[PDB]
UniProtKB/TrEMBL annotation, chains A, B:
Record lineage: Bacteria, Bacillati, Bacillota, Bacilli, Lactobacillales
Sites where the protein binds dTMP: 87, 179, 182
Residue ranges occupied by any HD domain in the UniProt entry: 25-139
Binding positions for Fe(3+) 1 per the UniProt entry: 28, 57-58, 134
Protein name (record): bis(5'-nucleosyl)-tetraphosphatase (symmetrical)
Residue positions binding GDP: 25, 61, 87, 140, 177, 179, 182
Binding annotation for Mg(2+) 1: 114
Top-level division of the source organism's lineage: Bacteria
PANTHER family linked to this entry: BIS(5'-NUCLEOSYL)-TETRAPHOSPHATASE, SYMMETRICAL, SLR1885 PROTEIN
Positions bound to ADP: 25, 61, 140, 179, 182
UniProt-annotated binding residues for AMP: 179, 182
Keyword flag Iron: yes
Record-listed Mg(2+) 3 binding positions: 117
């Protein structure tokens, strides 16, 4: 059960998340919970850890900038984090809020949430499951999501590679800064595209 | 004159480069020489240093992999360079071959050639001139070169930003590894797009 990892039931968690997040965002989290379960089954990851990490991954999406800056100071995190924003923070810093609120201490689940946006050069299978689940969950509708879904049916690594390449491509297309850890992920996984 | 910086005349250099490079590549170098002169005039860079760096920038384009690996060892360069290829090497390592052949010691010209492919987070105006000249020289015909040319008529910094964004976008589109220094350039300049 979820209570093996957090301080409340799944039902209790959903009630709490419904207060924290817009409807569309909670719907997304429920989508990631489901997609993570399917991917974990496929690729030999604990379905329960995948499901919970999937539900929780965007728990901190709506924290204010000030709250994130407070957490960076309190946990004495990488000071460079102050140069970024919500997209980097909600996973990389938001894990601390999740830990405070839910008493989540499982290192594997925390790490999967931590890097769900930016990845890392080295990712566990759980990390990859959450990273991909976020991109392919059934509520998502962006051009090319069909390709991501097909790839994810065959190869977890190629799915990470594809998603990361598309993210880097889109950020450069839009003229947004690219977090350096994102490139670390990109360069580590891009060989899987062939 | 060019002989103020190298061990031969411009005419002598062109004869030497004609033996080293395919016709199309030498034509390109002549295009960069010209574009660098125009940009340097516009943005307050020594036109002579810009012209020479422009002509020389791709001097080492046709060195073999083995020759580059030999130079990395001989000059005890960043060992990570062995994980890359011609695109990174011809500037970053090729400067040593240029120095050997032509007795080029001017630090400014060498640096501009060194980073003409990947840029850096900190670039001199000469560095930016060569970086942009390479992209907009009159022989180039790629979709969007007209936009690059317009931007370069107004802002050197925005031209660097635009070129770097398009390069990162294209590398990710194609599924090629992105040299980390390229991202350093991207993140440093992307603010100029606005
Ligand atoms: Fe997220
Ligand atoms: Fe998400
Ligand atoms: Fe070049
Ligand atoms: Fe060139």
């Amino acid at each position: 059960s979820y209570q093996d990892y957090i301080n409340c039931s799944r039902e209790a968690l959903l009630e709490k998340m419904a207060e924290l997040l817009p409807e569309k965002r909670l719907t997304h989290c429920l989508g990631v919970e489901r997609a993570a379960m399917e991917l974990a089954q496929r690729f030999g990851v604990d379905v329960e850890k995948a499901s919970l990490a999937g539900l929780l991954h965007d728990y901190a999406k709506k924290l204010s900038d000030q709250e994130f800056l407070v957490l960076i100071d309190r946990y004495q995190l990488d000071p460079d984090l102050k140069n970024w924003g919500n997209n980097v923070w909600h996973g990389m810093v938001g894990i601390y809020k999740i830990q405070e609120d839910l008493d989540l201490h499982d290192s594997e689940i925390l790490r999967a949430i931590e890097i769900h946006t930016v990845g890392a050069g080295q990712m566990t299978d759980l990390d990859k499951v959450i990273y991909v689940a976020d991109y392919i969950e059934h509520n998502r509708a962006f051009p090319g999501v069909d390709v991501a879904r097909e790839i994810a049916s065959l190869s977890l690594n190629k799915a990470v590679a594809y998603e990361t390449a598309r993210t880097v491509e889109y950020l450069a297309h839009q003229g947004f800064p690219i977090y350096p850890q994102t490139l670390e992920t990109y360069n580590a996984f891009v060989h899987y595209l062939k």
